[PDB]
């Protein structure tokens, strides 16, 4: 593949820059003779030549061209320019280009127009312009809809499909006369009959703002909607299948959307500039949602809400996903990343700001506290590997659509959010939002890199005369340009602090150099016997300060409420004082720091920085902990023990220990809910209740097993009167299936096939993977691959649910090794979250035998490659090596600890 030719290189030339496009698309919603669903379109792109060139290189993916005046395209001049004749065109598949070879060169700073006529498949592939399907009674409904991000706009029409190639778009949709056409903007005049065939209408839309190609959306459906003008005058509509809308299932979204949009407009002092923001829920959708500017698309499951069958956790999902997509109207649409290597400027911001918007709409839920579990601790697992990557990867490394898709990962989302949470904490949100307002104003309708953000934050810092140990850029560059995070180790006898790059495996090999030497500039907050001390900045690898020195009974903890992106170790004397505090009165330690103490110590133990028994000792007080968060932090960390040990002699004592620790909590909830008749008022208490049930049942509390089997049996006896509160359904369904047999399984499967809401179906689909019968798991695996039984959007998610079951481990890994080409080609090998399957199937590996299989899997498939799962395979290899050594080193001490402490 000759690298000297521009059309064989992945990045577009800088020689041409588009100005504006018109696009006409026409989906055919009934199959043709071939049984193929197709769309036909045309386009004109106007562009400026920035540097003289004899080739037009523009993106094109799976499009077929209708010849016009002897070629695939026609090239015309603008404002008097006179373009050369077209020599010939070619489609270059790897780089997804249409290449127009010219008989001469275009002229610098002149404009040109290029006309195309084309056709593509309206495939059920969830990418570009695609089809989604549902049933209304026995009538098949087919929807034309879109997903462009990252690199699929080019699959719908020829375009310069990179995010810094911003343009205006003039969209026309041609569609059956009975169906509604939607796009980013409002219709431009009324919808008129197609002259050649009045069975079709033609809907033209107003020109978009200047924007990136990946934000375009085109939808044709018979959906209904509810609507309300938001307090900032923007029209909000929630669109979904008619039955959902009539059932009122869009009403919650309508309650929160406009108010969140207005809240963000106010908080960032930057209006939303479009006349409307439609939210629309699609039956088939790859990701969770997509922030298309003016027409935000969602999985049905993440937009619709039924107050009589959806759980509180489902309700949290709706408001948080809406908040994230609305955050993007500012961070991503109005101001857009220059290139995908800086993705966190879109998604890290959306992941942080989503909590501010969700907290605005639901202030009693205290959602912002959950950032520590949902983001900080989530990303720290991968970011403690030598094979992690910086928040801002060098742009030169990110070239292919696979490499781009791969970056939609825990680093860009949750590390992005965590670093922003830290930043807002040390600046104050008042100062942070002032800098952000200036950033948004300056770069509106343009593109940014990470340096542009620091400049505007510096401006606010300078205006407020805030004194930092250096500039915003030099502090934040430490958290952005190098991977990883530090462990801060305190010696409370002398008050010394030291930092080093935290690695789960000390033996692992960091091959990525850092110009910052893996040293950070760290804002350190702290408490002494519960009282907050003065803040401190750690700039060097080591320092001394009496803030960190103790004597007598005093203890200190660093990182109050885990605002900072770092872990903390102490001398064992201070740890023993913390453990004493947890036994005396655990409420003296802020709840978030109770999660911290647990999660940090477990990770420190893996890294050989504290004995494993110290981390296990930190869970002893949980027997009297009622709060959601510290229990969730413990369960999260103990997940790793389950992965390492659930096929070993260690597992029984582990389960015995958890059964002892959770029983009083379970009994507390049994009494508090008046024998499961009620749910707690507070959302955190609701979540705590669900975990206590899940934990009690999984670890063999007999009252829990009886409760779930009894409830499930009562439902089977009364299928239309489900006695199980929505909050408990996931865990009751799973454990009833696990405790039961094929009769329970078949009932749940039938319920799943007959489901009317995605939420109920999702709970059943996860539950069916809880069977303990190998033959049932095998049969279920065969269903995941059948698009008539399990929608394609859900296939790999269900396979992951199977592999997480200890009996499905061998089954799924053997399946993955045996079917790699199929999974890669048909199940999203270059798309979002393909890493999820590699991660899930390999995370139990703790043996040389498994390692050798994984290395052989890498060798055997070198020709196919691993697409957007390439880094995940490297990380799987690193973790597997770490796990082998960790099991060797810990199995006997852990077995003895669980045995001695579970009685």
């Amino acid at each position: 593949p000759d690298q000297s030719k521009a059309w064989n290189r992945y990045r577009l030339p800088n020689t041409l820059k588009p100005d504006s496009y018109r696009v006409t698309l026409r989906p055919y919603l009934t199959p043709n003779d071939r049984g193929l669903y197709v769309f036909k379109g045309s386009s004109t792109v106007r562009f400026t030549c920035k540097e003289a060139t004899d080739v037009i290189i523009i993106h094109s993916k799976k499009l077929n061209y209708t010849l016009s005046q002897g070629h695939r395209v026609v090239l015309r001049g603008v404002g008097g320019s006179q373009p050369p004749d077209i020599d010939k065109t070619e489609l270059v598949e790897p780089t997804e280009y249409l290449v127009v070879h010219l008989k001469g060169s275009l002229v610098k700073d002149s404009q040109y127009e290029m006309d195309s006529e084309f056709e593509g498949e309206l495939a059920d592939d969830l990418a570009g312009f695609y089809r989604s399907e549902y049933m209304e009674g026995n009538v098949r409904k087919v929807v034309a809809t879109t997903q462009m991000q990252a690199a699929d706009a080019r699959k719908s029409f020829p375009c310069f499909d990179e995010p810094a190639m911003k343009a205006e778009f003039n969209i026309t949709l041609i569609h059956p006369k009975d169906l509604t056409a939607l796009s980013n903007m409002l219709p431009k005049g009324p919808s008129t009959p197609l002259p050649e065939d009045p069975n079709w209408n033609v809907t033209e839309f107003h020109t978009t703002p200047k924007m990136s190609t990946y934000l375009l959306a085109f939808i044709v459906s018979e959906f209904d909607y509810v609507e309300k003008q938001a307090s900032n005058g923007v029209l909000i509509r929630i669109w979904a299948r008619p039955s959902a809308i009539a059932a009122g299932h869009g009403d919650y979204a309508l309650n929160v959307t406009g108010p969140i949009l207005n809240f963000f407009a106010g908080h960032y002092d930057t209006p939303y500039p479009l006349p409307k923001s439609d939210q629309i829920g699609l039956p088939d959708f790859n990701a969770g949602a997509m922030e298309n500017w003016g027409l935000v698309t969602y999985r049905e499951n993440s937009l619709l809400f039924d107050p009589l069958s959806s759980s509180s956790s489902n309700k949290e999902r709706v408001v948080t996903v809406i908040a994230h997509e609305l955050a993007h109207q500012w961070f991503g649409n109005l101001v857009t990343i220059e290139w995908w290597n800086d993705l966190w400027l879109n998604e890290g911001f959306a992941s942080y700001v989503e909590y501010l918007g969700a907290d605005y709409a639901e202030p009693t839920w205290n959602l912002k506290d959950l950032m520590v579990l949902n983001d900080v601790y989530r990303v720290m697992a991968v970011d403690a590997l030598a094979s992690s990557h910086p928040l801002s990867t060098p742009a030169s490394e990110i070239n292919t659509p696979a490499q781009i898709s791969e970056l939609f990962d825990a680093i860009s989302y949750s590390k992005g959010a965590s670093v922003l949470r830290m930043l807002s904490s040390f600046l104050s949100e008042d100062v942070f939002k002032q800098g952000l307002a200036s950033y948004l104003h300056t770069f509106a309708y343009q593109n940014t890199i990470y340096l542009n953000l620091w400049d505007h934050l510096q401006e606010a810092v300078n205006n407020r005369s805030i004194q930092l140990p250096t500039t915003v850029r030099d502090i934040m560059n430490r958290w952005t340009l190098q991977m990883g995070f530090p462990v801060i180790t305190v010696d409370t006898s002398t008050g010394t602090l030291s930092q080093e790059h935290f690695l789960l495996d000390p033996d692992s090999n960091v091959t990525r150099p850092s110009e910052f030497n893996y040293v950070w500039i760290v804002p350190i907050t702290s408490i002494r016997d519960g009282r907050q001390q003065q803040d401190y900045w750690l700039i060097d690898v080591r320092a001394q300060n009496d803030l960190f020195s103790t004597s007598g009974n005093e203890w200190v903890l660093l990182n109050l409420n885990v605002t900072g992106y770092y872990r903390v170790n102490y001398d064992e004397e201070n740890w023993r004082k913390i453990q004493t505090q947890l036994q005396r009165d655990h409420s003296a330690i802020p709840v978030i720091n109770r999660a911290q103490i647990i999660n940090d110590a477990f990770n420190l133990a893996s890294a050989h920085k504290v004995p494993v028994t110290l981390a296990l000792n930190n869970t002893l007080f949980l027997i009297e902990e009622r709060q959601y968060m510290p229990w969730e932090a413990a369960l999260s960390s103990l997940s790793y023990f389950k992965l390492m040990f659930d096929r070993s002699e260690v597992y029984g004592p582990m389960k015995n220990y958890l059964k002892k620790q959770v029983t009083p909590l379970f009994i507390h909830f049994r009494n508090n809910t008046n024998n499961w008749r009620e749910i707690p008022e507070n959302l955190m208490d609701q979540y705590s209740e669900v975990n206590a049930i899940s934990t009690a049942c999984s670890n063999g509390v007999p009252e829990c097993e009886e409760m779930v089997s009894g409830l499930f049996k009562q439902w089977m006896e009364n299928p239309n009167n489900n006695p199980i509160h929505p909050n408990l359904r996931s865990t009751v369904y799973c454990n009833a299936i696990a405790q039961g047999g094929e009769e329970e399984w078949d009932f749940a499967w039938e319920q799943f096939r007959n489901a009317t809401l995605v939420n109920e179906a999702d709970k059943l689909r996860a539950a069916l993977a809880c069977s303990k019968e190998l033959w049932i798991l095998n049969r279920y695996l065969s269903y995941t691959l059948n698009p008539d039984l399990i929608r394609k959007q859900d296939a790999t998610s269900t396979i992951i649910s199977i592999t997480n079951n200890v009996i499905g481990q061998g089954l799924v890994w053997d399946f993955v090794q045996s079917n790699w080409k199929k999974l890669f080609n048909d199940y999203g090998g270059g798309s979002f979250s393909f890493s999820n399957l590699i991660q899930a199937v390999t995370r139990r590996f703790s043996t040389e035998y498994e390692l050798q299989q994984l290395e052989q899997f890498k060798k055997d498939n070198e020709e196919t490659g691993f697409g957007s799962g390439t880094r995940a395979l490297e990380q799987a290899l690193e973790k597997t090596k770490a796990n082998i050594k960790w099991v060797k080193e810990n199995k006997e001490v852990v077995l003895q600890w669980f045995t001695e402490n579970s009685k």
Binding site: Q149, A287, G288, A289, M290, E291, S302, R317, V321, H324, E325, E347, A350, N374, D375, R378, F408, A410, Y413, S414, F832, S833, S835, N836, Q839
Partner: peptide, 6 residues
């Protein structure tokens, strides 16, 4: 896009 935390 929104992707649920794995």
């Amino acid at each position: 896009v929104y992707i649920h935390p794995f």
